[PDB]
Amino acid sequence: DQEIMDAHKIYFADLNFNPSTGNTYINGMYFAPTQTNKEALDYIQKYRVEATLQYSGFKDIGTKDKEMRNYLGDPNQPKTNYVNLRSYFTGGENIMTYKKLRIYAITPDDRELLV
Amino acid sequence: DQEIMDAHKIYFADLNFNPSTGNTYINGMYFAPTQTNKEALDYIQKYRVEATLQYSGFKDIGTKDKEMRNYLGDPNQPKTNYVNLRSYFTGGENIMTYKKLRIYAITPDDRELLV
Amino acid sequence: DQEIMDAHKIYFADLNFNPSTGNTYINGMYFAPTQTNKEALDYIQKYRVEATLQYSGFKDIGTKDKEMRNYLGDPNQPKTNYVNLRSYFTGGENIMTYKKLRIYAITPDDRELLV
Amino acid sequence: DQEIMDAHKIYFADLNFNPSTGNTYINGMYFAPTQTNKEALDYIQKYRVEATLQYSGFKDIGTKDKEMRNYLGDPNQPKTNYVNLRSYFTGGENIMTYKKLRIYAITPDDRELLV
Amino acid sequence: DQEIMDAHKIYFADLNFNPSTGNTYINGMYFAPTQTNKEALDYIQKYRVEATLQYSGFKDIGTKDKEMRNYLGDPNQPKTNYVNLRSYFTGGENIMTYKKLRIYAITPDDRELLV
Amino acid sequence: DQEIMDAHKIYFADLNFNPSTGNTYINGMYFAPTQTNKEALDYIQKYRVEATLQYSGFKDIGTKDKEMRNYLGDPNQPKTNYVNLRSYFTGGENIMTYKKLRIYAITPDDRELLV
Amino acid sequence: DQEIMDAHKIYFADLNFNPSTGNTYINGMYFAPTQTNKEALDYIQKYRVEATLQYSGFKDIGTKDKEMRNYLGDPNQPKTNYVNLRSYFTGGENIMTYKKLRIYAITPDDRELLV
Amino acid sequence: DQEIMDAHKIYFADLNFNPSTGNTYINGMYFAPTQTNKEALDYIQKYRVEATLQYSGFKDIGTKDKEMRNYLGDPNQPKTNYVNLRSYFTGGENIMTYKKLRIYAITPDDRELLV
Amino acid sequence: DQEIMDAHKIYFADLNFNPSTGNTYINGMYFAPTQTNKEALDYIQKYRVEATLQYSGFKDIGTKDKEMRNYLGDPNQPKTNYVNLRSYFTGGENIMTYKKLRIYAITPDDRELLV
Amino acid sequence: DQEIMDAHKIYFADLNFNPSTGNTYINGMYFAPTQTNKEALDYIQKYRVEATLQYSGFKDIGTKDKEMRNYLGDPNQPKTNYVNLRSYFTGGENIMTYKKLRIYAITPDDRELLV
Amino acid sequence: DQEIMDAHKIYFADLNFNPSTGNTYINGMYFAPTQTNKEALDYIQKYRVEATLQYSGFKDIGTKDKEMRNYLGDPNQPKTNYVNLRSYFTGGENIMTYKKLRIYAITPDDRELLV
Amino acid sequence: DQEIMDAHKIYFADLNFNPSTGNTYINGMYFAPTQTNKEALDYIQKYRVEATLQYSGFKDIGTKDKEMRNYLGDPNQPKTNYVNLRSYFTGGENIMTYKKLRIYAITPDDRELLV
Amino acid sequence: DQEIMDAHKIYFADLNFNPSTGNTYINGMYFAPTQTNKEALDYIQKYRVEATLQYSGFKDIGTKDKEMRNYLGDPNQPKTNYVNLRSYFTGGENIMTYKKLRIYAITPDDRELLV
Amino acid sequence: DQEIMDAHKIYFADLNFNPSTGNTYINGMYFAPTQTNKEALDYIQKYRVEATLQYSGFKDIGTKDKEMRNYLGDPNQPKTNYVNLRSYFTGGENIMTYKKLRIYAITPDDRELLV
């Protein structure tokens, strides 16, 4: 059901501010808030990132799975998807310049979100 | 038992005040307080709102179900119905200008309350 | 055993004081303290009030049941009857001007206490 | 300026509730809240009560003076008069049945308030 | 310097929310925030309200004076004017339906703000 | 001593993070940290901003003065200059897109910093 | 075993002091502390008081049973008898002027203690 | 002015309760509450007791002076006299059986109060 | 095994100090600390005291049993015997003048310790 | 005035209890409580002890002076004398076996108290 | 699978700072953070150190086993290996000068990390 | 395996400092820390001390058993032996002058440690 | 007095440990602890550093003055010199690799300490 | 007055215990407690130590002065002398093996105490 699986462009990233610097880091993505007609988040299973770290930026980080907790940290909401940007093969932090998001169902590799 | 199912005009909405603004938002409706002769709240099951958000106001929000907790937050009261204005497909807040309330039993779509 | 069921004239009401007004509201009646010869409180079951609210005073409020907790809030006392003036079909508060108390055993409607 | 000195009928009494009884006692009178045209509270000086105590009710209690603190215990209000019902020749408490209020300027004895 | 003394239309009122009701009351007006070219708030001295109370709404309340504290309760701001809606000849509360605002310099009576 | 008064390009802005949004606001500029050869911050006196607010972005905000507190909130540092982005003719917040900084000595209007 | 059942004259009453009065009230009787030769407290079962209340003093109060807790509120003591002066058909308090103590075994009515 | 100096029969003693005994001890006498016509407490100066201690009861204790603090420990009361039963030549405590009260003005020795 | 059952002369008493007196009372006896060769504390079972109370000193108090808790209140010690001077037929306290200690095995009455 | 200076036999010592021993030590003597006829404590000035320490008991300790604080640690008492058993040429503690008390006025050496 | 078992050069040691000295001690090694292609940490089992202590530095310390807790003390990370530098036959502390790390699989003794 | 059972000379004693004295007491011995080649602590079972107490120093104290808790109070250490110097037939404390340590396996009495 | 002003080689640096890194930073130098014969710290006045920062390491930092507080943070010590490594023209932190220390009396530039 | 200035052999040292070692360090000497006949501590002024440190033990430490605080840390004692073992030219700690104590009056160098 390919095309509507590409059609969930609305998204939100979770932030973390560091004082005594001037920048904000990403530590998670509250992904695909539940609209009226969207239940294709059952077929899609696995996620893969290619981000920009603080040291040696563009690199493959690895493939992990979704963790459906909530939307916007609110208890009375549906369960939406959430890409966790911590359980990944990294040591540094992640910044907000550019990023690529390769997504794995059974055998596609669709690029679903580009900043 | 249609007509008395339309005859429960008494209602109350639950509020939330924001300081450093001047307005009050709605976050729930303590609906149909129990009068002497009203037990038609068993047949009615599902609810649907069409409200005015802070951004792109009039839109269909979706259909959800009742949560009979209490009336006016008081422990020694009967159980009345309560439309929860949080478990709905929204991201913003809701305001107090105008609203429409489409109600679903088995196959009617009766408009039960208009502000 | 009708007449002694009418003969329990001693009673006490439970109060609630509001500051920044000048009046006191009723929120319960510790009813029929246990005297030496009174065990007719087993046959009587249900109670009904016709009180004076803060808005639209004299009206039928409804029929409810007894809740034998204690007398005067004291732990080492017998269990006496208690009319709860909260689990009743009302929204406002109750005041101390005038009141009527219609009491239901199997099929009498005896008026047991008049202020 | 006699007649307007009689014309300040609006008043308020300060209460004290005792639990494990059913009554409320008077312990002060926030007297003559400041209206638009009333500055005759400068000429009047002394006050005298004839109240109903808990024991041997109607008796002369004595003559004392005013204590202009506030109105309704609120800091941002004008200063109004206040009859203190504690600095008086009594030992018991005062109740809310009936009372007489004899007021002393230079040589009148005007009865200013009757309950 | 009459006309610019009429030209300060930007304003803000200070609110107070009561739970277990559904309304919000006014208890002050943070008046005339300091724009780039406005120093006519020195000539104007006294204020007078004609509001709508909870009981017997439209009435003259009286004339009082300004209290320059701050703007929006913030310490690092200029001093702006503030109409205090408490030091006025009233006993009840004030609501948000309609209001009239008669303002007194030396001898004008300009109506400066109408809701 | 014009040119070195233009030559203090190193700067730092003070931030404020809002949760339940995704952005960071500016609320001050710790300006011109003290290098080895820079004592031209005595001649310069007044500052003027032209920023982008949350509503009606590009506008003249006004002219104010410096407040030499510290650098980076640290007690054992020299006193450097600080543009306060709060004591200015605004009501909303300020964001980080674009900004202009017009600076006033006796009679120049030098643009000292552009983002 | 009648006579030694009368021979336990040593006793102690439990007190309660009220400030802002001058008197002390009785609220229990730690009865018959265990001497060397006294085990007749097994045959005796029920107790009855005729005391002096604060209002309408001498009256029959009723028959109740013993509650063997301790002696003098001390944990390392034997269990002695205790007449509870609270679980009795009264509303007021009890005072220390005069009292009568009618005691019920199977069919005697022995007066065991007189003050 | 001898006779009215004898005519102040109203009095009150201050108590102290000891638990794990059954008695109450006297530790002060709030003496001569202020009635309407009594200002003979200026001429009288010194006091002397002959009480009953816990050991070797009836003995002369000594002569001391008055300490006008208040009446009944209440701040808004007049100043009345107070015999302090602690600053006296004793080591034990005082009990409530019998007492004699020898009072010294310039040269009388009037017995003013007998229990 | 009589004689070594008499040969445990080492002992210790447990004290209790009262301030505002000058004396110390006995409230227990940590009896027979465990030496190298002493296991005759198994055959001996019951104890009896004849002490000096505060009132009517020398009297038989009664027979009770041992409570092997510890020695000197220390957790890492063996279990030694302990005569409890509280679970005995008394009402007052015990003092340190003179005492007699009659000890009961099956049928001896050996006096084991004399002060 | 020699003989009455010898006639103040009533005295009291201040104690200190040590747990994990069995004894009580002396750390002060509240000396000569004020009786009715005793004001010879003005002429006497200096004190000298010959006590029994924990090590090398009977020895001259030295001469010191009185410290009139109170009697029995009570604030509402007269000032009586107090021999301080700490400001003396010792290192150990003092016990309660035997003691001698040599007292120095101008030139007598009267032994005033012997235990 | 020998060579890639040698190819995990990335590592991290856990530190402990002592104030009132100038040095930092090692108390653990968070070993082999999980990269993309490394699952040879299953075959390797046992570890052995030859470190430099504070006293008699170079010595064999002994052979122990791995404790897979986390990486960098972070809960949302994979499980990596951890050499515990406490459960080893030592008494002193370990310093940061030089160290040797002999590692035991079934029968190799590969030196895996040298500082 | 006698000789290596004698060869564990490394040891450590556990201390306890008393203020207001100048000495330190022994209250345990963390015995035989685990070296590389020592597992003879399984055959040895029982211990016996001959120490110097505060009173009547050199005496046989008795035979007790080992309590393998830890080494140096540290949780991540092996279990080593520990002679408890409290569960022994003593009443006083132990000091650090001289000591003898007689150790019991099945039938030897080897002296293992001498200070 | 040049040469002994060079002869104070003993020194100490003050540290600061950062967790979640592996290094320690310098934030001060407790300089020249007071030996027996050293009072040349009066003539020397000013100090200058050339350190290695975290970014663009070797650079002139500037000239500042001494702050004689203490030695090793201890209150009962003499006053020694202290180079403050914070009041210097820097923004980053300082590390422990290499450093140069140029010292200014009236007109020498002696290098006093090299790591 | 030389010889009695040598005759004050009684002394006491102040200790400091370190856990996780086995030793106690000296950090002060409460010197010459005040006996009956000793007031030669006025002529003596200065002190000098030659102790054994933790590193390079026997060395001259320097000359300092007395600090008369108290004896044994007790407030109600005379003022005795106190050698402070902290304000001395050292960096390490001091131990309890051997020590020499050279004392300076005007021109003697008497060795007053040897351990």
mmCIF file of N, CA and C in Angstrom, chain H residues 55, chain I residues 15-26 52-55 93-97, chain J residues 12-17 22-25 96:
data_model
loop_
_atom_site.group_PDB
_atom_site.id
_atom_site.type_symbol
_atom_site.label_atom_id
_atom_site.label_comp_id
_atom_site.label_asym_id
_atom_site.label_seq_id
_atom_site.Cartn_x
_atom_site.Cartn_y
_atom_site.Cartn_z
ATOM 1 N N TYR H 55 3.971 18.174 100.952
ATOM 2 C CA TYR H 55 4.645 17.711 102.159
ATOM 3 C C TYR H 55 4.655 18.841 103.170
ATOM 4 N N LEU I 15 19.039 0.195 84.710
ATOM 5 C CA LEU I 15 18.661 1.370 85.466
ATOM 6 C C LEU I 15 17.757 2.287 84.660
ATOM 7 N N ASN I 16 17.200 3.261 85.369
ATOM 8 C CA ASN I 16 16.348 4.291 84.806
ATOM 9 C C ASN I 16 16.477 5.521 85.685
ATOM 10 N N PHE I 17 16.920 6.628 85.101
ATOM 11 C CA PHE I 17 17.175 7.843 85.867
ATOM 12 C C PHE I 17 15.995 8.791 85.730
ATOM 13 N N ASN I 18 15.573 9.341 86.835
ATOM 14 C CA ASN I 18 14.557 10.375 86.822
ATOM 15 C C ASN I 18 15.181 11.735 87.114
ATOM 16 N N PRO I 19 15.066 12.688 86.196
ATOM 17 C CA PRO I 19 15.443 14.063 86.520
ATOM 18 C C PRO I 19 14.412 14.680 87.442
ATOM 19 N N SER I 20 14.801 15.806 88.049
ATOM 20 C CA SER I 20 14.025 16.533 89.066
ATOM 21 C C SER I 20 13.735 15.683 90.304
ATOM 22 N N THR I 21 14.479 14.598 90.466
ATOM 23 C CA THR I 21 14.707 13.874 91.700
ATOM 24 C C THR I 21 16.207 13.645 91.804
ATOM 25 N N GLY I 22 16.613 12.815 92.749
ATOM 26 C CA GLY I 22 18.029 12.563 92.879
ATOM 27 C C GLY I 22 18.372 11.096 92.860
ATOM 28 N N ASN I 23 17.442 10.257 92.417
ATOM 29 C CA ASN I 23 17.623 8.828 92.593
ATOM 30 C C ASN I 23 17.448 8.115 91.266
ATOM 31 N N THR I 24 17.801 6.838 91.271
ATOM 32 C CA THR I 24 17.749 5.985 90.097
ATOM 33 C C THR I 24 16.968 4.732 90.433
ATOM 34 N N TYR I 25 16.110 4.316 89.526
ATOM 35 C CA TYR I 25 15.248 3.179 89.773
ATOM 36 C C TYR I 25 15.700 1.990 88.945
ATOM 37 N N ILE I 26 15.360 0.803 89.423
ATOM 38 C CA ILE I 26 15.704 -0.444 88.761
ATOM 39 C C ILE I 26 14.525 -0.851 87.903
ATOM 40 N N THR I 52 11.644 -3.624 97.553
ATOM 41 C CA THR I 52 11.226 -2.465 98.333
ATOM 42 C C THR I 52 10.669 -1.432 97.359
ATOM 43 N N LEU I 53 9.355 -1.237 97.371
ATOM 44 C CA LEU I 53 8.714 -0.306 96.451
ATOM 45 C C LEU I 53 8.814 1.108 97.003
ATOM 46 N N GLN I 54 8.160 2.061 96.344
ATOM 47 C CA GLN I 54 8.098 3.402 96.911
ATOM 48 C C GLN I 54 7.072 3.499 98.029
ATOM 49 N N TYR I 55 6.094 2.593 98.067
ATOM 50 C CA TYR I 55 5.061 2.607 99.095
ATOM 51 C C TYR I 55 4.821 1.183 99.557
ATOM 52 N N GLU I 93 7.111 2.326 91.660
ATOM 53 C CA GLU I 93 8.444 2.052 91.150
ATOM 54 C C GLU I 93 9.269 1.328 92.201
ATOM 55 N N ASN I 94 10.427 0.848 91.775
ATOM 56 C CA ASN I 94 11.326 0.102 92.635
ATOM 57 C C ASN I 94 12.605 0.894 92.853
ATOM 58 N N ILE I 95 13.146 0.823 94.069
ATOM 59 C CA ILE I 95 14.333 1.598 94.419
ATOM 60 C C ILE I 95 15.490 0.678 94.766
ATOM 61 N N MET I 96 16.641 1.265 95.096
ATOM 62 C CA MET I 96 17.906 0.545 95.180
ATOM 63 C C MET I 96 18.416 0.366 96.609
ATOM 64 N N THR I 97 17.529 0.198 97.585
ATOM 65 C CA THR I 97 18.025 0.051 98.947
ATOM 66 C C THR I 97 18.290 -1.409 99.282
ATOM 67 N N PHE J 12 21.026 20.909 97.707
ATOM 68 C CA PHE J 12 20.716 19.996 96.620
ATOM 69 C C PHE J 12 21.894 19.937 95.665
ATOM 70 N N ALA J 13 22.200 18.737 95.193
ATOM 71 C CA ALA J 13 23.294 18.520 94.264
ATOM 72 C C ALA J 13 22.752 18.221 92.877
ATOM 73 N N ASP J 14 23.518 18.599 91.861
ATOM 74 C CA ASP J 14 23.129 18.402 90.472
ATOM 75 C C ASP J 14 23.859 17.202 89.896
ATOM 76 N N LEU J 15 23.117 16.352 89.203
ATOM 77 C CA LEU J 15 23.610 15.041 88.836
ATOM 78 C C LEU J 15 23.845 14.928 87.341
ATOM 79 N N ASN J 16 24.502 13.835 86.975
ATOM 80 C CA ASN J 16 24.790 13.484 85.597
ATOM 81 C C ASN J 16 24.896 11.973 85.524
ATOM 82 N N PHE J 17 24.048 11.353 84.712
ATOM 83 C CA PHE J 17 23.993 9.898 84.633
ATOM 84 C C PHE J 17 24.783 9.420 83.427
ATOM 85 N N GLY J 22 26.960 2.041 86.006
ATOM 86 C CA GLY J 22 25.847 1.928 86.919
ATOM 87 C C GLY J 22 25.789 3.051 87.922
ATOM 88 N N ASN J 23 26.516 4.133 87.670
ATOM 89 C CA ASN J 23 26.685 5.140 88.700
ATOM 90 C C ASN J 23 26.316 6.508 88.156
ATOM 91 N N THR J 24 26.229 7.463 89.071
ATOM 92 C CA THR J 24 25.851 8.831 88.767
ATOM 93 C C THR J 24 26.896 9.769 89.339
ATOM 94 N N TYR J 25 27.265 10.771 88.569
ATOM 95 C CA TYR J 25 28.317 11.680 88.976
ATOM 96 C C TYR J 25 27.730 13.032 89.338
ATOM 97 N N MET J 96 30.007 9.887 94.255
ATOM 98 C CA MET J 96 29.080 10.200 95.336
ATOM 99 C C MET J 96 29.360 9.428 96.625
#
